[PDB]
Amino acid sequence: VIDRAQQRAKADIMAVEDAEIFSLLEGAATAVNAVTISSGGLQRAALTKAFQEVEK
Amino acid sequence: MSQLSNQEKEYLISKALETEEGRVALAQAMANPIRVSLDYQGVGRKLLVVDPLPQG
Amino acid sequence: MSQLSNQEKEYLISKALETEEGRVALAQAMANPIRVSLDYQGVGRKLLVVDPLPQGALPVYDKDVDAKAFVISKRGQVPDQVIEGDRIQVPTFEIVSYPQVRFSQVKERRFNVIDRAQQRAKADIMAVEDAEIFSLLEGAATAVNAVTISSGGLQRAALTKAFQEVEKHDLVVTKIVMNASAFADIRAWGQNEFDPVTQHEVLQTGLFGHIWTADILISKKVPQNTVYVLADPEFVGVMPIRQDIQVIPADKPEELRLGWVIYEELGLAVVNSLAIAKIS
Amino acid sequence: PYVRLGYEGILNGAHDIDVAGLNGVEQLAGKFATIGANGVKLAGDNGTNAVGLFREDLGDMVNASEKASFYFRGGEYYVNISRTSLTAAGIAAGDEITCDADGKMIKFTGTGKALGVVTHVGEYRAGNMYEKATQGVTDTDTFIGFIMYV
Amino acid sequence: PYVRLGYEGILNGAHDIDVAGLNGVEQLAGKFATIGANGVKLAGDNGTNAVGLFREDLGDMVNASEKASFYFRGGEYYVNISRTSLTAAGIAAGDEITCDADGKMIKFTGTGKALGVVTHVGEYRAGNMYEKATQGVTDTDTFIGFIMYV
């Protein structure tokens, strides 16, 4: 179950399997990225790009 | 062994022989209970995935 | 009454007798009361352990041939050890000093309890040294987080690693010098910015405990949940013994303080223990 | 070599597996040597060593032969290049190691011949010199350990 | 001197002092052993194993390394001549002993790193080298034997 979970989250699909979290997703615009430290702010910032996609 | 032998000068130990005690094992976190699980009875599952959508 | 000099016949002998004339004892410098204890009889312990696994194995179809996975193990044997010390004292010196008798026994006893823990958990593997735990445990590194950052900063960073294992931490096992500096929070303000800012030390950071032990290597910190992860089997408990009747007392009147234990250490699941090495 | 620390005290002190440079014939596909358990963080001689023949694990790890008795597999076509140092307990490569030989010298202890069984401890031992046999050319009998040729 | 009759950790077989002095063709100044009394065919076999350092006490007795306060028993380059007898059966250090200031081989390392002392056992077990009397020598021996000379 551990080995499955490891493979399933990261990286692009194989030819024996479909749906992997990493494949399914999109990037994020240059705005989310900062040049001033504030770990909380980056993650916060990311949520708003995600909202346009309609993620609850 | 596993570290310097201090007194054991038998390397056989009767074709292996060990007493009732904990055996070390791995536990890892997973990205599997993060994603929702539900059961299905059928021979295959069909999904729709969104292709490019023209807002034109 | 009044002396006039630093020179005294009075110095040689006791001029007052009390059970207190000064002394020390430490509780936090030993990893053995922290862990759970159970007796065992046998000259050794036999464990089977898991070998390296690369990990991974993705799901494949039912019109394609099924995937497999395997586990590999090596078997290990742990022999028992004896830790012991003797300290040799002259009766005249002992009787006159008074609390010296108590102090020498308590110190030699403490010293044996430190040396058992030191070998089993850490040390290196040599021709007169063991090392069980240190070898087995899985890697973790502070350096990935940052290379050169405060003593406070390391201890905070370190807590997080344990979560991964599915411990969700318990407590952090650190070296005494290291623990002192982290608590102090030195970075060249020596103000708190990784420990609570209204205190000059703390005994919970992240809401988790700190155990400070001197039986562990210098500039090494270990997160683990001590009670599940290791267990201490006792063939013989630690005990002081005293003998005034052996070869060297016969030749010249001498008193021996004997301090010893016979130990073994059990590892119930030691690949949950993480070792991290401090940079700063 | 180390049958002189051996004779039933095997896997104590430095032991190599080699007394002479290995024969030709590369093995293809690189892989690591480790004799540890979830990493080698063993430093210094004595303790578990990677002397003995080897077995492939996940085909990504090679380690010492530490299986069960019965259905034992004799000779093998290579031994690992020595990385025996005091920064290690025997051979254990922290890079990928590539092996070679037509088979080479190995270490055998016990009251057998050159072939024993495994009790899940490094190398082979076992009695019965008439239910076991030499590996390599000419008859050699075991009395204190010797380097037996595959 | 006999080297390689020792056991694991820093130790050397027993040393017979035939080199740099030998009593049996000369007689000098005897004095008592305040270690040892065990051993047959001349005791001394658990008074000393390979000749430490011998230091006079009160009156004329010499003895081995012992103590770490109130007159360090041991030290100086005045060593006990063990003569020719039997190796680990005729070591003299439990009898009345003749010493000189010259002699080989002189062992001074106990089991594991640190300038050794002598306990009730003739053999050496491990002190310190900066909280115990030093003679100008530090042990640079690694684990498993190898010669030491004062």
Q: Are E133 and E72 in contact (CB under 8 A)?
A: yes
Write the CA distances from A10 to A24, A42, C52, C53, D60, integer angstroms.
10, 21, 22, 19, 21
Judged by CB atoms closer than 8 Å, whether chains meet at B11 and D10 is answered as yes
**C96 beta partners:** none
Residue A31 has which token pair? 């705005």
Of D134, D144, D1, D124, residue with least CA distance to D53:
D124
Q: Are C223 and C48 in contact (CB under 8 A)?
A: no
At residue D134, the 3 state secondary structure works out as: coil
Whether D and A touch, i.e. at least 3 CB pairs below 8 A, reads as no
Between CA D131 and CA D117 the distance in angstroms is 11
Chain C residue with Cα closest to D34:
C52
Residue written as tokens 């916060």? A44
**D55 beta partners:** D63
Give C145→chain B minimum CA distance, Å.
20
Write the CA distances from C104 to A41, C29, C109, C237, E119, integer angstroms.
59, 17, 8, 19, 18
**C243 beta partners:** C256
Residue A11 has which token pair? 């990286």
Of C47, C38, C30, C32, residue with least CA distance to C235:
C38
Sequence-separated (6 or more) residues with CB below 8 Å from residue B8:
C43, C44, C77, C79
Between CA E125 and CA C57 the distance in angstroms is 54
Q: Which residues of D touch C74 (CB under 8 A)?
A: 35, 37, 48, 63-64, 66, 120
What letter would DSSP give residue A3? Answer: H
**E124 beta partners:** E118
Q: Which phi and psi angles does C19 have, rounded to 5°?
A: -80, -15
Q: Which site among D41, D42, D85, D117 would you substitute to test the C interface, given the most C Cβ atoms closer than 10 Å to its Cβ?
A: D41
Structure determined by: cryo-EM
Between CA C218 and CA C252 the distance in angstroms is 42
Q: Considering just the CA atoms, what is the radius of gyration of chain C in Å?
A: 25
Q: Are C170 and C204 in contact (CB under 8 A)?
A: no
Does C64 lie at the interface with A, CB-CB under 8 angstroms?
A: yes
How far is C-alpha C76 from the chain's CA centre? 23
Q: Which of residues 10-49 of A touch B (CB under 8 A)?
A: 21
Between CA D67 and CA C74 the distance in angstroms is 7
Q: Which residues of A touch C64 (CB under 8 A)?
A: 16
Judged by CB atoms closer than 8 Å, whether chains meet at B27 and C130 is answered as no
Give B35→chain D minimum CA distance, Å.
29
- In C10-99, alpha helices (H): 91-97
Chain A residue with Cα closest to C67:
A16
Chain C residue with Cα closest to B12:
C77
The two beta strands, C208-213 and C171-175, are parallel
Q: Residue C159's CB: how many other CB atoms inside 10 A?
A: 17
Residue E140 has which token pair? 């640079």
Does C51 lie at the interface with D, CB-CB under 8 angstroms?
A: yes
Q: Are C194 and C157 in contact (CB under 8 A)?
A: no
Write the CA distances from C118 to B5, C122, C134, C214, E109, integer angstroms.
17, 6, 11, 8, 22
What secondary structure, in 3-state letters, does D73-111 show? Answer: CCCCCCECCCCCCCCCCCCCCCCCECCECCCCEEEECCC
The two beta strands, C266-267 and C208-213, are unpaired
Report resolution (Å) to 1 decimal. 6.1
Between CA C188 and CA C197 the distance in angstroms is 15
Q: Annotate C170-209 with b (16+ C-beta within 10 A) or e (fewer).
A: bbbbbbeebbebbbbbeeeeeebebbeeeeeebeebeeee
Q: Are B32 and A5 in contact (CB under 8 A)?
A: yes
Between CA D68 and CA D65 the distance in angstroms is 9
Between CA E57 and CA C248 the distance in angstroms is 14
**C276 beta partners:** C221
